Amino acid sequence: MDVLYSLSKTLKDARDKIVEGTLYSNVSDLIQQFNQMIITMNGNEFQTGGIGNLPIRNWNFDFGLLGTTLLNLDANYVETARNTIDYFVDFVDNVCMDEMVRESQRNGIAPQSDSLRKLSGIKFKRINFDNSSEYIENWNLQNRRQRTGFTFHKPNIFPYSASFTLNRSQPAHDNLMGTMWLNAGSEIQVAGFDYSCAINAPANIQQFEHIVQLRRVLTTATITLLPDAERFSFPRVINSADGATTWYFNPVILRPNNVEVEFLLNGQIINTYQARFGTIIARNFDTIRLSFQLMRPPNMTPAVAALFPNAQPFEHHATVGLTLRIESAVCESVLADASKTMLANVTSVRQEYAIPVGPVFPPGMNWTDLITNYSPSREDNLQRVFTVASIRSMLV
Amino acid sequence: MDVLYSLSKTLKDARDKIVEGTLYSNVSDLIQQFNQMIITMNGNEFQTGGIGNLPIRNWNFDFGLLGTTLLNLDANYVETARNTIDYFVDFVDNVCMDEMVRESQRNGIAPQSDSLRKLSGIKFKRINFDNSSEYIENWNLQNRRQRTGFTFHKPNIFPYSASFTLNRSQPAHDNLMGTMWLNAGSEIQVAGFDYSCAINAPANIQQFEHIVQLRRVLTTATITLLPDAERFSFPRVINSADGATTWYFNPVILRPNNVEVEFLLNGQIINTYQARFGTIIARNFDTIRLSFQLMRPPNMTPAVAALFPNAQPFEHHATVGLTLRIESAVCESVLADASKTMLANVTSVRQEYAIPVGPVFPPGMNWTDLITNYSPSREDNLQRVFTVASIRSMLVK
Amino acid sequence: MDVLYSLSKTLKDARDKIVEGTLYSNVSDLIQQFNQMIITMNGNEFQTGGIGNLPIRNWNFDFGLLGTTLLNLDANYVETARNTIDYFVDFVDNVCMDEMVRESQRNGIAPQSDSLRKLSGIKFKRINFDNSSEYIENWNLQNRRQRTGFTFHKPNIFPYSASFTLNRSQPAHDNLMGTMWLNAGSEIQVAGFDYSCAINAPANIQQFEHIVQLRRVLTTATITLLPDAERFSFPRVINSADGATTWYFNPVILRPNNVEVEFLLNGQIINTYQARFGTIIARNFDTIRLSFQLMRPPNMTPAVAALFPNAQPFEHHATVGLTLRIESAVCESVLADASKTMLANVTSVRQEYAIPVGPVFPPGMNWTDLITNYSPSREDNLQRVFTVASIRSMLV
Amino acid sequence: MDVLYSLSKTLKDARDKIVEGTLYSNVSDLIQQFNQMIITMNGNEFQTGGIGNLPIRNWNFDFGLLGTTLLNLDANYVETARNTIDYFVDFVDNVCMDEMVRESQRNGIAPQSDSLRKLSGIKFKRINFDNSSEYIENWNLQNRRQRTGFTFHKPNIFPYSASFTLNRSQPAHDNLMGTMWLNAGSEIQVAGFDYSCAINAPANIQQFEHIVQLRRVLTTATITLLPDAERFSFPRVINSADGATTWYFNPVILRPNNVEVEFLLNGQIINTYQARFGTIIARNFDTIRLSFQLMRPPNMTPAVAALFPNAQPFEHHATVGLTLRIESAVCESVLADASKTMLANVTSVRQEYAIPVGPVFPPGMNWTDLITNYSPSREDNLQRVFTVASIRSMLV
Amino acid sequence: MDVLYSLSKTLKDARDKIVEGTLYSNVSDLIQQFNQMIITMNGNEFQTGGIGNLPIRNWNFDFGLLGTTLLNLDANYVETARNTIDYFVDFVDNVCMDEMVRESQRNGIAPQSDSLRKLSGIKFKRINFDNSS
Amino acid sequence: NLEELMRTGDYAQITNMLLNNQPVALVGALPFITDSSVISLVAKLDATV
Ligand SMILES: [Cl-]
Ligand SMILES: [Zn+2]
Ligand SMILES: [Zn+2]
Ligand SMILES: [Zn+2]
Ligand SMILES: [Zn+2]
Ligand SMILES: [Zn+2]
C-alpha cells in the first residue's frame, strides 16, 4: 500500500513538476525518486486481474532513466518523461482498480490483488518515499499501533432510518403519543408528538427520549442543535407499524421543553447540553441521547386554547422537535462524508466492471447496509479500498 | 513494555539460576545479560508513583558488575547478586504498579508512567532479551499487528445478567409464556417456561429462543451443553418487569425438544449442533443462538396428566432448560478468566492505593461494566495493564 | 513428529529471542540451531494440502543463513530474520494442518501426510533438538514403550449419558424405585429415588448402586464428593424407557446414608471412602462404584411424617443424591479436558476445510462417540493429531 | 531439596535434549552439568525406603562421563546417556518417595529421609542449578525468609461442612428461621430461610448473616458471587441438630435483599461489595462476611399472596441464597487446588506403600482434617512433601 | 544464637577475669577471644528495633584491642577493658531484649530480630567459642 | 553474494550446496575464461571450477 502510494505520488509529482523551462534544481530529488522507481520496476512482469469485466492486463517495465544534466528542462525532456509517465500511470490505475474490486473476510486489510502482493515484497521497498496524504498517513500510523484519525465534514455516520415509536396508540389512531425521527447521514431530526397535548399528563408534561447509538466513536465533533424538526412539522399520512392502515398527523409546533442533549461514551455522560442551541462540541462519544418535553402552555390565548380541547377529538396535535447536524468530526475508522470521494470512487469502479457481490460488502456497496453492520472485517476491507481509491485519485 | 518485561525476565532468571554451587557455564549468558542490564541502568534516575496513595519513589542505579572469573558460584557471589537483584526487583515492582494504575483515552496502549516512558528510549533497548511469555508474545505480535491469541480457561465473556422475557403474560401472572436466563462469566443458563404446557399451542410445541451477543469474537472454543438448567428449576417469587408486583414460578422440568445451538460470526452460521449434548467445538463465533422447544408429551401417566389440565388454573408450569459452559476458548483480546490473576492483580493494586476513577475504566474496575462496554480504547488500556500485571507477577508473585 | 516439533520450537525461540537490541550471546545457540535448520531444509521441495478444502501449497527453501553481530542485534537483523521466520512458520502451520486432518486405521501413530513423512527421513534428524513439551515428551516415551502421563484438569472422560434405571416400576409409574444419573465430562451426578420412602424395605433401608466404567485408567486423581445431586432434586416429567409414556418425579431430598465410594482397577478395590465428602484421592482406577442408601428417618416431625404415608398414593418421593467431580487426574492416554485446546483445534481445522469423514474418528470429531468407543487405533490417531495440534499452537 | 530438584531438573533436561541428531551446541552446557552431576554423585552410597511397605533400596554411583567431541548426537551417545539417566531417575524417584512418606513435628521443613539429609551436605551443592519451577522458587524464598506466593485455581481453602443454624425453632419444626450452608473447596453456598416470610418482622425484613473464617490469608482473589444457592432451593428432610428428629424444608426462592459481601483481614474491612454480582476482586482477606436479607414482597399476585398466609401453617418457606466461588487466588501457604496434583501424588504414595499414620498429618491424608487444623507444623510438612512431589512429577 | 551466646560468654568472662592485679596467664586465652570479638565486630552497624515501646537503638563498633605485655593486670588495663565491656554488654542486652519480644508462626526457632539475623552470618562465626550452658 | 561470503569467512552454506549439488547463483564481479573449444564443453570443464 505504501509502495503503491509511492508510485502514485512519484507519478503525480512528475506530472506536476516536469514542465518545460523549469530549473532542474526544482525537480532534482523528484528525478532521483523517479529513476529509483524505474530501476526498481525494471525487469518485473505484472498482471492486473480479470475479476468481473475488468480485463486481464500484462505489464512490462524496460524503461530507461531520465536525464539529470540540464540546467532547465526543455521540450525533449518533457516528452521523454511523459512517454514513461503515461505507462506508469496506466499501470498504477489498473493496480488500484484491481485492488479496489476485491475483498477478503479473514484478512481484509492485507493486499488482495497479485500485483499489490508482489509490490509488498522487500525488493520494491526502495520505491517508498514521502507518505503525507491523510489516508496513507493513517494507514502507516495504524500499522504502527498508533492513535490516528480521519477528519470528516458532515460524516455519514447515521444509517438511513425514517421510523416512529407510538408509546400510546389505538386502532383508530386518534389519540397518539410517540416519537418520529429521521437519522440520515450526519443529520438527526426527531419530534415527539402528543395528540392530547398532555392534558391528562402529570404536571401537564410529556417526556420524549431518543437514543442514537453510533457504530463508531466520534471525537472533536462540531454539532448544530436547532429546536425544531421541520421534517415532522406538516400534515402527514403515515403507514402503521404493520402497514395494515394509515393514520393522520397534524402537527402544531411548540417549543421543546427541558432539552437535554447528552453525548455518552461507554454509557457514561461525556458532554451535557441543557437548553443550548447553536454550535456545541462533543469531544468524544459513541451515543447521543436527546431528552425533551412537551409542556402544555399554562396560559393560552383564545386561538391557542381552541386548538387543545379537554378531550377528544384532537384535530391539532402538539409536537416538539429537535435537529442535530454533525458538521465536522474525527473518527478512528473510515467513513463516507460529504467532502470526500472515496465511497463514490469505489462504488463507481465496482459498478462499471460488473463486480459480483463478495462475502464482505453488501450489494452495490450500499452505504446504509454497510454502516448498519460495520463489522471489523468490513472496516478492514473498507479502509483498504478507500486508501487505494485515494491513491488512484492522485492520478485519475 | 518489552524493556520492562526484559528487566523482570532477567531478574527472575537471576533469582532462579544464580545459586550457590552452580557451574558458571550454567549462567554465563545470564550473567552477560545481567551485566548488560546493570550497565544500561547505571547512572539513570527514575521516579515512580504520584497517583493516589502510591508513594513517590526515587530510584538510583550505581552497581558493580557480577564477576566472571569463577568456575562455580560461591556464597558471597550469590549474596552480592541477590542484593543487586533485590534492589532491581523492588524497582521493577514499583514501575509495574505505577503503570497499572494509569490510563489514557488517546494512546492507552502506550506507556503512561514516566518510568516506562523513560525505559522506552533507545538506550534501554539493549536490555531487551527473550520475550517468551504468552502476554508479551501477544504484545509484540499486536505491535506489528499480527494475529494475536489469548487462551482462556473459562473466559469471563458474559457480563452478569439475570433477567426474563415474557412473551405471554397478563396482570394476574397465572398463564405465562417466556424465558428466564442467567448469563454470568463463562456460563449461560436459559429456561423457557409455559404455564399452560402448550395445551393450546400449534401442535403442542412452544418454541423458545435466546440470543447472546459476545462483545469479542471467540475461537477454538470447547463448550459443554447440558439439557437442564438447574438455576430455574425450583419455586421462585419473581419481581415483575416494572417491579410493581411479584409473580410465582412453580416449574416442572421436561426435557427440551429440537435443541439447536448456533454459533454465528457477523450473522453467518459457523457451527450448528442439533440434539447434541456434552462437549462441542465452536471454532469461530461472536453470537450464540439457543433455540429449544417445549413439546407436550402425547402420552401421560395419571400423575403427569394431573399436572397439566386442559385450562386454568395452572399449578405446575412446564419448563425446559439449557446450560452452556465455555470451558476453554481463544480470543484476540485480553479477557478475565478463571485461571489467571491479571484482573485481580490490577484491581488489587488500584484498590490498595485508592486510585481515583479515571476516564477509561469503570468506577472501580467492575468487570461487568468493562465487558459490557468493551471499547477499543478500553481494550488497549486493559491489554497494557494486564501485560504489566503479568510482568509484575513474574517477580512480586 | 520430533522433527516437526523441533522446527516449530526453533521458530518459536527465534520469534521470542531474536528481538532488537538483544545481546548476540542471548541467541548464539538459537542462531546456530536456526542456521542448521536452514541448511537442512534448503533445496528440499514440500507439498501440503489436497484434502478437503485445504489448498495445495508448494514450499521451497532457498534462504541464506542468519548472520552475526558483535554485541547486540539491530532492527535490520530482526527484519531479515523475520522474513525467513514468517515463511517457515507458514510452512510449519500448513504441515501441521495437513497432518491433523488425516487418519489411518493401520499405523495411526505413523505420519500420514507426505510432508511429515518426508520430514521423518534421516537427513532431517539434524534439525531435532530439545523435546521438552508435555506432548512431545509423551510421544517419545510412547515410541520407547515407556510409561506415558498426561495431566488433565477436569478430564473429559465420561461420555455424555443422562439415563435412569427403574428397579421397581409398573405401568402407572406411581410407586417407583430406581436411580437416575448424568455422566458428563468429568462429572457424575447420580440420585437414587424411592417413592415409598422404604416403608416396606427391610430395616427401612433401600440400597442404591451406580457403576461407571471409565474407558481409560485414571491415576493420581483428585475428586470432589458432595452429598446431593442438584440435577435430580426438582420435579420433572421423564420419558418412559421405550418412550411410550411419561412419568412424574417429585423429589424430596434426604441425606444419603452409608455412602461408599469404591475406586476399582481391573475388578480389584484400590480406594474406599466411607461417609467421606469433600476432596478425596483416587490413586489408580478404571471403575467407580458409588453405593449409597435411602434410610427412612425413624423419627419425623408432623410435616415430615405427612409426606411419607404408610401406603399409596405417594406424592413426595424420597431421593438421595451423590455428586462426584474429577478436578484433576493423570492418564496414560490423551483426552479432552477443560484447560487445553487440542480437541478444539483439531475439530476447528477439520470443520474449516470441510474434511470428509474418515474411517477412524466419528463425524465432526464428536467427543462422546470418540470416548465411548476409544479403540487403540483411535487412541493412536488421536495422540498423533493432538501432538500435531500442540506443535501448531506453539506458532499459531 | 534444591539438590534433589537440581538432580531431577538435570535428568529431565537430559531426557528432553539428549536426542539423536541434535547439535552438540544445543546440549554442550547440559552435558557439562550432567558430567558435574556424575562427578558429584560418584563414590556416594545411599539408602532409601524402610518405612511402611516401601522397600529398602541401596544406591551406588560409579558412572562414566558423557563424551564431548561429537558434532551431532548419534544413537550410541543417546543409549550411553540413557542407561545413566535411567539409574539416576530411579534413584531420584525413590528418594522423593522416601521423603514424601515421612514427617516431623518440630522441624518438618527440614529433610526427614536419610538420603535427602545426606544430599543436603555442602559437597553436593555442586549439582545445584536452575531453580525455576514455582514450588522450588517458593521453597528458596521461604529458606531465605522472603515473601512466598502460590497461585491456585479454585483453591481448596474451605473444609467440607454442610451445616445449619436455627435462630427460631420449635420442637415441631414448623415455624423455622435460620440459615443453612455448604462450604466445600473453593465454594460457599448459603441460604437464609424464614418459614413465616418475615410477616412478623419489624420492617417485614429478616436479616441473615454468614461468617466464614479462612485458615489462611488469600490475596489477589477473583470470586464469582451469584444471588441464588441452588443447593438449598429444593425440598428436603433434614436431621435435627441433635439427630433426635427430622424436619421438613420446602423452599420458595426470593431474590436476596441488600446483599453485602465483606472481605476482612484481622477484623478490618478490606473489601466491600453491595448488591454486586458476577466477578469481584478480594485483594487481601482471611474472613468472608455475607449479609443478606429476605424482604417480604409488598405487592403480591393472587398466587404469590396465596403462598404466604398471615399465620401458620406455613407450607411454603421463603428462602434467599448466595453463592460465592473463588476461581483464582494467591496464598503464601501451600494448598490443594483443582489444577495441581501434589496432594494426589502424596496421598497416592502414602496409600500405595501403606504408610502408618504419623504424628503430623491426619490419617489417609484427608484434606478436610488437614485444612481444618492447618497448624504451622502441618504447613511446614505439607510444603516439604508438596515440593518433593513436584520434583518427582518432573520425572515420574 | 551461638554467636550471641558467645558474645555474652566472652563479656561475662571478661567481667569476671579481667580484674586488677591478676596474672596475664589467667586471662591470655580470654584476652585473645576478646580481641577476636573486637576484630569481628569492628566496622559493623547494628540496630535494635522499635517493637512496642522498646527504643530504636543504633550500635557502632570501633574499638582498640585489649593489650598484651602485662605480667599482672593494672588499673589502666581494667578501666579500658571496662569501658569496652560496658558498651558491649549494653549492646548484647539490647539485642537479647529485641529478640525476646518477637515471634513467628513458622520458622520460630530462627532469629527474629535484625541484629541476631545479622549475627547469624558467616563472618561472625569467628566469635563463637565454648557453648557450655 | 560472493562479497558477503568473502567478508564473513563462513563457507558452510556454499560448501553444503556444492557438495550436495544444490543449484545456486554466485553473484559478484568475477573474471571468466573464454573457452572456444567444443571439446571443453563436451568434457564439462565449466563444472570443474
Ligand atoms: Cl474450573
Ligand atoms: Zn399504528
Ligand atoms: Zn410481569
Ligand atoms: Zn417406565
Ligand atoms: Zn478449572
Ligand atoms: Zn431442630
TrEMBL record, chain F:
Species, as recorded: Rotavirus A (strain RVA/Monkey/United States/RRV/1975/G3P5B[3]) (RV-A)
Top-level division of the source organism's lineage: Viruses
Family named by the database record: Belongs to the rotavirus VP2 family.
Location relative to the cell: Virion
Role: Inner capsid protein that self-assembles to form an icosahedral capsid with a T=2 symmetry, which consists of 120 copies of VP2, with channels at each of its five-fold vertices. This capsid constitutes the innermost concentric layer of the viral mature particle. It encapsidates the polymerase VP1, the capping enzyme VP3 and the genomic dsRNA, thereby defining the core.
Comment, domains: The N-terminus binds RNA. It is necessary for encapsidation of VP1 and VP3. The N-termini of 10 VP2 molecules form a cylindrical hub underneath each 5-fold axis of the inner capsid.
UniProt subunit comment: Homodecamer; each decamer is made up of two conformers of VP2, called VP2A and VP2B. Interacts with a VP1-VP3 complex. Interacts with the intermediate capsid protein VP6. Interacts with NSP5. Interacts (via N-terminus) with NSP2.
Full protein name: Inner capsid protein VP2
Post-translational modification: Sumoylated with SUMO1 and SUMO2. Sumoylation of viral proteins seems to have a positive role on viral replication.
